[PDB]
Amino acid sequence: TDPLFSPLDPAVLADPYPVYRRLRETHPVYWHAGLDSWLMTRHADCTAILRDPGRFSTDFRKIDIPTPPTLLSLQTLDPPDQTPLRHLALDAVRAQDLDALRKELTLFADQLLDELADRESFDFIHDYADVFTLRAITRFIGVEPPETDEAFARFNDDLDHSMDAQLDPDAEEPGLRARAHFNDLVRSWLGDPGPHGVLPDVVRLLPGSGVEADDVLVNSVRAFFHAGFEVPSRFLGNALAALLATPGAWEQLVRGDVGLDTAVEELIRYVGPVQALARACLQDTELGGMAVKEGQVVTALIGAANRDPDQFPDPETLRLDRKPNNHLGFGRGAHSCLGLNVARIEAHVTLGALLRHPGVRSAGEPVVRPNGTLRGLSRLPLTLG
Amino acid sequence: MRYLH
Ligand code: HEM
């Protein structure tokens, strides 16, 4: 077990931020034997990794690591190999009508929360966030949602768990299996698209994009869909949990001593769900006084870097009026988030709608999902008001 | 830890 950072340790999973802070103070560039990687905890070094594809690659084949099936995709290539898919997706995404989306979501949140106000109590994660973000992402892409039976939550759990495979090698094969399942769902979608949305635009925009219609585009569409579903749900659960656990904070939003603009951004900085982004070093480099060798992996701990006191005054405090707030919640560079505008609409719509129920309060203990790469809750018991 | 969907 690691002297400084065990990300699947339950005591760390309950609250990783003190471990982050201590790690940043003592070894800001730290060699983690178990993850077989360097860990960067500082805002300046994570931004430097994220901005330099020539020196830090997502294509681990460049350091002789074969890419498993279902995983070669937009996320796991660098420019210029990645730029056609990146541009196809950027175009497909900008061709969408975000006001239509926002308005349909606002109707949906208001109806969902009047339904949940009728109950004694409910779980915000499974009864609101997951329902809401699944509607959001299937409307945005233009597909019919999958059925949310227990097999769906089972593939979702395996896929999330698979991100931590370096620490649990038995998690790999179920993640590939789970990702293949959702590829079978993506192929169906692409094989009979509807008339509007991101996915229809991709099919339409293929001719002369430079992108072939193969499993690489399929893996890319699966990852677009799965991130579009899960990451906002992780965020919504973390955000509401932090507001209720932080004295005075919800009261500040209710009274209107702060806008959703600075508040949503500060919530992303403080408890954003993405904790780690790994890259392969293609050329010897010095970071933090440590010599990173060609062939080694480095990991930007952006969740830790977003609480770096070198960048943020009073980094451990939820300051809903924070300005400036140059957080890395949505990444930087060739692989920055394509859904950040959809992410922020969901957060403003969800929060706007909860502010209709000022008496909202916890109704039990939150439960943290056992994931280190992508952090979120599996329940947030609540009663509305 | 690879953030890969
Ligand atoms: C609060 C919610 C979200 C957060 C915090 C978030 C965060 C991030 C981060 C940090 C990255 C960078 C990954 C890397 O550098 O390797 C990323 C990439 C990405 N995001 Fe998001 N994301 C969110 C929601 C969404 C949504 C709603 C969508 C789609 C509708 C989406 C689609 C993508 C895709 C496809 C990429 C890969 C880009 C590439 O590899 O070029 N994300 N996101």
Numbering used by the authors:
A (entry chain A): 10 to 394
B (entry chain B): 1 to 5
Question: What did the article's authors report about this structure?
Answer:
RufO is a unique cytochrome P450 enzyme (CYP) involved in the biosynthesis of rufomycin, an antituberculosis cyclic peptide featuring an unusual nitrated tyrosine.
In this work, we apply various biophysical and biochemical techniques to investigate RufO in the presence of the peptide substrate, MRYLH, and an alternate substrate, Nle-RYLH, where norleucine (Nle) replaces methionine to eliminate the potential influence of sulfur oxidation. The integrated enthalpic changes were well fit to a single binding site model, yielding a K D of 0.78 μM.
